[PDB]
Amino acid sequence: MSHSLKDFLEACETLGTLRLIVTSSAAVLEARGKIEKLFYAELAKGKYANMHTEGFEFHLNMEKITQVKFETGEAGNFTTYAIRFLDEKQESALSLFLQWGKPGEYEPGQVEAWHTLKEKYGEVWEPLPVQL
Amino acid sequence: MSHSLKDFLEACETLGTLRLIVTSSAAVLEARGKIEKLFYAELAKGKYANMHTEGFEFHLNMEKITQVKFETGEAKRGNFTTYAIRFLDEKQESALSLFLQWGKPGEYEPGQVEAWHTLKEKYGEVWEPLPVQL
Ligand SMILES: [Zn+2]
Ligand SMILES: [Zn+2]
């Protein structure tokens, strides 16, 4: 399965509140927010998807993402729902988790929206070449 | 010279609102907030500095930082001066950058830039963490 990473990122707006996770060699930042109002720009280093919210800013070099995977886990006694954006080394450059309110209480239709994306794009898939 | 990374992170509370930047191989996340209410924990992979706010959670493996550098830069959009603290790993790559958070372009909080220079003078423009201890 091969799909547009741009289309997919925009489609993540349907997931409601997310926990966006980016990890370096030594740090982790886990930001709470909804994906929306994405803007794109091409630079020397890559073709970027970008977001500016009140609490945080986000940039994704779409050209470096080789595969996207859906994943569930266990937290409390409840299921977690994640989407991983993997790089050439098969390491997660970005992870998106559905964000609950009180522990395990997801937003109405949120878990459904996640399954809808997984069914539409597939369990694991590779992005098509990026064109801005 | 060498200093305690723990003491340094505690001292960062004096810098007011920061912009915490963590970069992976392909993504950048920037979160706005003061470095305050830090808590430490020893995990399997090492001693971590952490923060929990409503908007974000932050974790730093202190044992992986080999060098810390103060840098004044210039913003791409605005052409205004930026003030950063970069936490380098063993590859001399920034595992975390803390920027003074600007309001309007080049606008900082009262005493904030002076506080950055004071911290820089106290720790040095480039310094190395001591073996991590809480
Ligand atoms: Zn940015
Ligand atoms: Zn966390």
- The CATH homologous superfamily of chain A corresponds to HemS/ChuS/ChuX like domains
Query: From the 3D coordinates, which CATH architecture of chain A would you assign?
Result: 3-Layer(aba) Sandwich
Strand content of chain A: over 45%
Structural class of chain A: mainly beta
Largest beta sheet: strand ordering of chain A: 1-10-7-8-9-2-3
For the secondary structure, the number of strands of chain A is 10
InterPro entries (chain B): Heme_Transport_Util_sf, HutX-like
Organism (chain B): Trichormus variabilis (strain ATCC 29413 / PCC 7937) (Anabaena variabilis)
Protein name (chain B): Heme utilization protein HuvX
GO molecular function, one term (chain B): metal ion binding
Description:
2 copies of one chain form a homodimer. Chain A has helices spanning 5-11, 110-121; strands at residues 2-3, 17-23, 27-34, 39-42, 47-52, 56-61, 67-74, 79-86, 92-98, 124-127. With 132 residues, chain A is mainly β. Chain A has a single domain (2-132), classed as Heme iron utilization protein-like fold, CATH 3.40.1570. In chain A, the strands form 2 sheets. Chain A has a 7-stranded mixed β-sheet with strand order 1-10-7-8-9-2-3. The first copy, chain A, is globular. The relative contact order of chain A is 0.26. Chain A binds chain B through residues 20-33, 46, 54-62, 64-65, 85, 87-89, 91-94, and chain B through 20-33, 54-61, 64-65, 87, 89, 91, 93-96. Strand 3 of chain A pairs antiparallel with strand 6 of chain B, so a sheet runs across the interface. The complex binds zinc ion (2 copies). The site of one zinc ion (ZN) has 2 residues of chain A, from strand 6. One zinc ion is lined by residues 57, 59 of chain B. The PDB classes it as heme-binding protein. The entry lists the keywords structural genomics, joint center for structural genomics, jcsg, protein structure initiative, PSI-2, heme-binding protein. The assembly is dimeric.
